[PDB]
Amino acid sequence: DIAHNLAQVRDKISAAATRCGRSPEEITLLAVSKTKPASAIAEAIDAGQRQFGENYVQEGVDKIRHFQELGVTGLEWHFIGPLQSNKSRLVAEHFDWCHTIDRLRIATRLNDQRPAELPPLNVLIQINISDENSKSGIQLAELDELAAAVAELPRLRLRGLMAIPAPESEYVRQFEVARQMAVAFAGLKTRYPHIDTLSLGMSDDMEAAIAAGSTMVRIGTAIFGA
Ligand SMILES: Cc1ncc(COP(=O)(O)O)c(C=O)c1O
Ligand SMILES: *Cc1c(COP(=O)(O)O)cnc(C)c1O
């Protein structure tokens, strides 16, 4: 039951924030609806969920168009999958956020294809903080340079960072890795304007990510099942 699952996830988030001395309002729940049908999303919407993450362009755009045509206003759609050049126009025209900026050319493409009447596309730069096997994300040493270039793009808005850490079961390593992201995030925040989003944490490392300084967790299975 999606409505019950949303309540359960929101409870765990709230507890984790409170335990480490943070206001639960600091933590945004991104409901990851990848591979789930639009009816499942509609249940979540009926239960008050407004922010949804999708990983595949056509699937996500089809959902966006569905809920726009039902005249459901007030939603926020985040693209959190890897972005290919030949599918960036659909992201630029329909999504509100994109978490996976890891090369300048894809951000310039998104900026160029974003209609001017839309709000700027909110973007995070994705860090590969700890995953040997992944080809997504930049190294931290590239961040200052990429952030400067992306920051000039007028149809985008740089809001912070995202990372998918390598899968990790030891709480200690979950926290230490998430802290590396939080340190980078804080350093970015002191020099850049409107840095407010650290997209970090899924169901299995939610507590360490929140304790370390995440502002946004990405939950799929624990909301929608599998
Ligand atoms: C269900 C579904 N919809 C849409 C797409 C669109 O693909 P892409 O993520 O490359 O944009 C994919 C395939 O990757 C998909 O699996
Ligand atoms: C799919 C995915 C999630 C959610 O995964 P679950 O294990 O089902 O909770 C979160 N973030 C990203 C980037 C994902 O691709």
Residue numbers in the entry: 3 to 228
Anything the authors wrote about it?
PLP binding to YggS elicits a conformational/flexibility change in the protein structure that is detectable in solution but not in crystals.
Although the actual cellular role of this protein is unknown, it has been observed that mutations of the PLPHP encoding gene affect the activity of PLP‐dependent enzymes, B6 vitamers and amino acid levels.
